[PDB]
Amino acid sequence: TSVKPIFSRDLNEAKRRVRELYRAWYREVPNTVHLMQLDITVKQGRDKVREMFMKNAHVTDPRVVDLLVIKGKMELQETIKVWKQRTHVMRFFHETETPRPKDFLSKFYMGHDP
């Protein structure tokens, strides 16, 4: 315990920042899908932002959350500008890779080490 704070004293304040970033991405998804001529649906894209945002929903550590948005914001900038060309963005969608089943029987049938 006894840990110095980064940008938020408590998860509460931190959550404020997450809200802002969500908004940022939400407002940005449409633009990217147009400035990068990405073949995705804005609704789909915002879903992705949601997924990525949610993937880390479990965290309850004020300090960890603050870094997470710092990092998140940085990603936004890159995407806001065209620093991240489409190849970079679409990677988020994991479009080419073949999905792996998580069913035990499925894995048994395919991989030595699951």
């Binding site: 035990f104 029987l105 048994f108 030595h112 080490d113």
Partner: protein, 133 residues
């Protein structure tokens, strides 16, 4: 034929004679389509429909804990034993020891070199066996 693995190829547990449970670590991934012994049986149970509860090995280690203690605690011999009650039941049992002398099957060292499966399948053990013979 449902091929399995060998102790070089699985994170299984064994226990020697004074009950010290010990853990084999996977040195090499199992060959061919061959799979870890515990999973073949968990999978057969799923095809059968009486699925076993564990689905990961930590879970099977938790299973071993409910049926037996040594299995989960490694490198730890179990101190107390109950010899006195064992004798009482031995006293109840009545049996005849036949006059035939008791003889160890491994009378001389050629007896020793090939015993288990891996041993029997050994070209080095086979070379050793013919050297003795």
């Amino acid at each position: 034929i449902l091929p399995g693995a060998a102790y070089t190829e699985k994170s299984a547990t064994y226990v020697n004679t004074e009950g010290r449970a010990q853990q084999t670590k996977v040195a090499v991934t199992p060959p061919g389509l061959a799979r870890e012994d515990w999973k073949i049986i968990r999978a057969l149970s799923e095809i059968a429909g009486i699925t076993l509860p564990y689905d990961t090995l930590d879970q099977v280690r938790n299973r071993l804990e409910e049926v037996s203690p040594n299995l989960v605690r490694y490198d730890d011999i179990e101190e107390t034993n109950y010899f006195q009650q064992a004798s009482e039941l031995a006293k109840l049992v009545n049996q005849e020891v036949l006059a035939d002398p008791l003889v160890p099957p491994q009378l001389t060292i050629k007896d020793f070199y090939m015993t288990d499966s891996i041993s029997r399948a050994s070209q080095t053990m086979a070379k050793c066996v013919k050297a003795v013979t």
